[PDB]
Amino acid sequence: ERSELTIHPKEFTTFVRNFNPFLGATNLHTTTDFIYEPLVVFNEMHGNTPVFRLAENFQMSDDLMSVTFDIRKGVKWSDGEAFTADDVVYSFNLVKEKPELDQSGINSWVTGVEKVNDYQVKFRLSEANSNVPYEIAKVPVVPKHVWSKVKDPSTFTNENPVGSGPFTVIDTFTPQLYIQCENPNYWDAANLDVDCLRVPQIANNDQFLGKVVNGEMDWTSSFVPDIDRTYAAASPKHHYWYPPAGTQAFVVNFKNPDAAKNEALTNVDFRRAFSMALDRQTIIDIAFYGGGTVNDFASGLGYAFEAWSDEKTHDKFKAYNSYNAEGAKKLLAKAGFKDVNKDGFVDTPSGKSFELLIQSPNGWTDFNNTVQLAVEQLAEVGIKARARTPDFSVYNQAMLEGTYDVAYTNYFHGADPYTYWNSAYNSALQSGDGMPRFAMHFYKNEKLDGLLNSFYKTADKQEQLEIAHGIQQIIAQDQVTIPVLSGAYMYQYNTTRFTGWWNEENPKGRPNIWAGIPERLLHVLDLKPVKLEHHHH
Template sequence: MKPALLLVPVLVLVVVLLVACTSSSSEPRPRQPGTLFVSVEQQSAWVRNFNPLFTGAGSRWPTRAGVYECMEVFLPSSGEWTPWLATAHTWSEDHRTLRFTLREGVRWSDGRPFTAEDVAYTFELLKKHPALDSGGAWRFLEEVRAEGTHAVAFRFSRVYIPGFSELAHQPIVPRHVWEKVADPVTFTNPEPVGTGPFTQVNVFRNQVYEMGRNPNYWQPGKPAVSALRFLAFPTNDQANLALVEGEVDWAGNFVPAVDRTFVSKDPEHHSRWFPLYGSTVFLYPNTTRPPFNDVRVRKALSMALDRERLVDIAMYGYTRPADATALNDSYTGWRDAEAANGAWVRHDEEAANRLMDEAGLTRGPDGLRRMPDGQPLELELEVVGGWSDWVRAGQVLVRDLRKLGIQAHLKTYEFSAWYARLQKGEFQLAISWSLDGPTPYTFYKWLLSPRTVRPVGEVAAANWHRFGDVEADALLTRFETESSPEKQKELMAGVQRRFSELAPAIPLFPNPSWGEASTKRFTGFPNAQNPYARLSPHAEPDSLLVLTRLAPREP
């Protein structure tokens, strides 16, 4: 236990020493006026990809919410929708048709007008190429048609009220460009044409890329920022050093002891905001592989974990242990008290050992647990190598699992390799995020619905643990047609109880929505006092509001 407890001060000391050693001898590299330096992805080298449609493509930020745009933007901090490419929407009386009124005067970055034909064509692409339809829009859509130049109608095959957010948040692409693309799944879109505030690729090299302003952006005088610049940082530590040293203006990084290492260095200009509005971080067991198909094993693994210690060591106390609903703080009004009180997320080594024994995974003379065929129970936990917070979390989890008699090992991968294995179900255990939406429907659909299960080897947008439950899905299906808020909450309480009963994935903690900013060169960042959007650049699509609100500081 001692080495683990020493991990926190040692890591803080490393950051502090790096800052001390560099601050007196180096200055941030020269930059063009109005250029905002952003740290949002950790990569050793950039790959030129601006495809907004294929979630498995690994497109560069801000492709999906900055180069391209959606029709409306949901803000978790307020629970409200903000019009964007669309100015209004209406439902038909039978909730089978949804119409969006599109904003007039919008042009693509090449000067061509944005019309309803572009919206209709985007959704036809999703229909023609199911790999692009990660949200499953064509599971509830029957037809999409343009009605003139500035209205588009979505005809549903069934009543599906949650479908609104799937449609409203879909990035829209230009028909006149994409109809010439042979394969939109593999297309890397090196010269993007979008409606967003930043569409021009000024520079693209292995270690740096820069996005310039859209010359035809529809918001007059915006963006005030002239360009976005991104340096390749292979690890969190390198990205954090650049932030602390003033080279980065806006970041979405996990920063150890952030108040000491970053905020206190320049309290007038440095700020951070970490609301628990991020996704929930899970330990995902691949339920297609024994013994993870046994709920007793999943709950035993969960009860073996000391979450209080986990959030203190790995997350520096920025968050809290997950309860048995796994919901983050943006869903506080939905949380069911009975489901939240499930004992299987509380640290209880005795109960964990008992469940493992009941599942037939008993200890041998050497104290190690064995599968029913006598083979040692050996598990590999996969994380992204450059994400220091998740690496530390993995180290803590592995130690806890070893106490349960499991030969657990931590395996790190570069992001692209890790994400490919996760999406295809080619792992045993993995730490990852959840998908979220305006209500808990999206969150639980991707945790529990058989409709979201993909075969191993096929790319999945989520439900990486590949679990489906018919009973939970029946409640989710009823939710899809229910417009009464009271009845929606009743149904979602039932879903939460089913989640707690089945433990399909193991919730660890709500992920803070990481956001750090320096106002030394730019102003207008959101914060707790002005929460017009989340500060984290990872928070898409509300990052669009930030990109269009920021402005260079007046001399």
């Protein structure tokens, strides 16, 4: 009687009812896009082509110091009230007044928002930035007529959401399953053929594997080991498409509170020897079953941005980011990391023993295995390390608070190098209660920040390329992180119950179901239920 699409955007041990789009640490990951539709979805796989949703147009000013957005008329909230400029203006003012709700750093860019009329908003910028409509689209727009009356938006759980997107009705909710049904007032209802999102609680990759192999899922983006043998071979309806994704690296804490570990981690010779100890292709072969590409760029750029790469820089530092056990041992010796207590593990120049604790998230088994391989490879050059696999929130918090030693992490990936470099190295993103982990190495370089903040400042493509080369040089020469590989956008789909999926023959955009992939809105608008085959009673 209704089509239910079973999706898996995020692992949870238990579902807590939270649909606050600003509360990324604690909300459910079907809130953004599916409850709160964006102004615009930029199709990152297709050159950031803008797909207009609740806005029908935007227009930048002469000098890139402002931009105006035109709001689509006739759009209703799920309670029947009108979607207008009022809501956009309020949402941005809310994030400005309460910066712990800024999860992107939008406050650094937008100094003010002004209602031009009921269907146009103007944004004033702190600085010139041709990329700011992209930034603006990241901010959730919530209904002012509801949220302005809310006690405290920063602690509002929003259990009965009023939304603009396709699925706003909470049909069923249990700690282990919830079902999110069609917005009865959805502006783009004629384009939508899925009735409900069905979201089961899955805690880790182990629990996932059993369910996906058994055909219990429709749309997922989890790591699956030996995928051809385990999942694809199980049914002719089991499909996948793994387009290339972003950089993954070992990130070291430059502000480690332990004296010995700080001494090691802040030493560029040590970071380079660490990096040379790793066998990146073996990590890809074993931990990812071949699903990745070696990243031997000291700057972490990766091979998917060859038009952008300064090949002289890449070549200069590539040796430090290539498997070379003997080279690593020789460098540790030259630097003065000498074993002075006969245990085969190097000690710091001041003579102190230490063991690096390397963390990755609990249940992210491909990363867990990567870390364990690295532990073994590090031991072969005399670097003592051991693995920890803390709960994601604990993992995350340790990075935010700077209490970790080394962490393995992936990064956002975009149509140009700025998505990675800015999110991973801009020191402004090292502070703020809404900030993610990505820049939390606490390396700070003012010249680097300056180049990043200038990337979209001139409409001059050659200058922008020179800025990129400058960024690449700084990060490479300082071996700020230890890049390992370029990963994949894991994505599995089931044709048993639905058709219309994006895939290698229909590569319309990033196909993943994770929150933070706004294209998943466009994707679900393409899916159509299948007439089930008849069976007993």
